[PDB]
Amino acid sequence: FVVPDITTRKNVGLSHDANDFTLPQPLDRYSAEDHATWATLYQRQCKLLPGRACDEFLEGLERLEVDADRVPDFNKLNEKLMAATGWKIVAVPGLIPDDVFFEHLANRRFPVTWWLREPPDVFHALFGHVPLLINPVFADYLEAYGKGGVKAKALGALPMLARLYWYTVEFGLINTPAGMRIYGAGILSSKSESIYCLDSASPNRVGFDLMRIMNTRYRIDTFQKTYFVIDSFKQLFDATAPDFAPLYLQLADAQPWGAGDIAPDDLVL
Ligand SMILES: [Co+2]
């Protein structure tokens, strides 16, 4: 039997732009259970993350006044976000087309799935991704990433950019004099990956390298076998400076590294 998935069920009776896939945040659809689920997840992560999350993340939560006790009102969060970096969040139904996603980031709009899991959803999107948008360097990296979507799509290279996003925005680590810390949203909203990614001898931790990352496969249904480590958000933004076109064409005929591989030139940490 095939039954409707959560995206389908949550969006019953709602609409989305056929081009940019946005909708007004459906505030009336959040139940008491939803706000309680949000509060539980928020409390859980805030207990786990001190000394694991990078300091910029935890500061972003406070500066944006991300609600501890209910699903945040997107309009209200946008007041603080816009004043900080000129970014805003927009509600989407769930997974959206790539050109749409990129066009949003290119225009300093961060798409956020509106609905919450039952006890990627709004907790992952808002709690995991949004706090770093208050950091001007990180925000500029995301904008530059978004702007690269047009060229990538024209060259059939969206999956190569997707690897860069996965291994930075979703699963990135940042080294600090106080020790290794986390900036990837997929780790920051996770119950357990926050522990494994810093505490386990199992995963590789490899210095950030643009070409290497864009040549590296990933899997979505398991903890990462490799994490890439930056020294600063400036490293990410600076990585977007050169022309990616000749990089895509070189990668196109290469054999990608497996998710668990160490490459001969890796700086292994
Ligand atoms: Co994500």
Residue 128 CA, ligand 1 centroid: distance in Å: 7
What method did the depositors use to determine the structure?
A: X-ray
| DSSP letter string, 192-220 | SHHHHHHH-SSSEEEE--HHHHHTB---S
Residue 172 sits in a domain whose CATH number is 1.10.800.10
Domain that holds residue 79: 1-269
Q: Report whether 104 belongs to an annotated binding site.
A: no
Task: Please count the structural domains in the chain.
Answer: 1
Residue 180 phi, psi dihedral angles, 5° rounding: -70, 140
Residue 91 CA, ligand 1 centroid: distance in Å: 14
Closest among 258, 133, 146, 249 to 185, alpha carbons compared:
133
Q: What share of the chain is helix, strand, coil (3-state, %, to 5)?
A: 50, 10, 40
Closest among 106, 220, 107 to 166, alpha carbons compared:
220
Q: Report whether 16 belongs to an annotated binding site.
A: no
Residue 23 CA, ligand 1 centroid: distance in Å: 19
Structure tokens at 65: 């006044």
Tell me whether strands 181-182 and 173-174 are parallel, antiparallel or unpaired: antiparallel
Residue 110 CA, ligand 1 centroid: distance in Å: 11
The C-alpha atoms of residue 167 and residue 164 are separated, in whole angstroms, by 5
